[PDB]
Design a protein around this ligand. Sequence first.
Ligand SMILES: *C/C=C/c1cc2ccc(N(CC)CC)cc2oc1=O
Length: 133
Amino acid sequence: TRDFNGTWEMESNENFEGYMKALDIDFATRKIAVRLTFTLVIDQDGDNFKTKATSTFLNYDVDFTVGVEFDEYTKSLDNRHVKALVTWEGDVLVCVQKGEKENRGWKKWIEGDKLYLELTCGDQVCRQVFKKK
Ligand SMILES: *C/C=C/c1cc2ccc(N(CC)CC)cc2oc1=O
């Protein structure tokens, strides 16, 4: 399936700290962020995605169109400029954030009712799993 619509509640989180440290996120923010769960809300209409991940503290809020590159300021996260592009590799949704950091981006896919997220920066991979509400 290429349909990621839903409210996705966090089931699993592995190595979020390594990903954030590879982005050089300030220590106090990273130490608080690694403790906190969050919910991922995806509104998808064709190529058009609105995604938002909300925790009691931090924010993640990105809208994009599959196949359309966009210049992105990463704002609240690590305050960097990247050229972001989201495409399909089969049923895996792949994002590359071209810029200073190597191997920066993510992959999302659905495997037996659960949403998998792999966040990558440099040699660090964070894996998260969510269940659909
Ligand atoms: C494709 C989904 C990406 C994604 C990336 C994220 C980056 C940072 C954060 N937080 C917690 C709200 C700040 C440390 C969350 C987040 O969720 C995602 O789904």
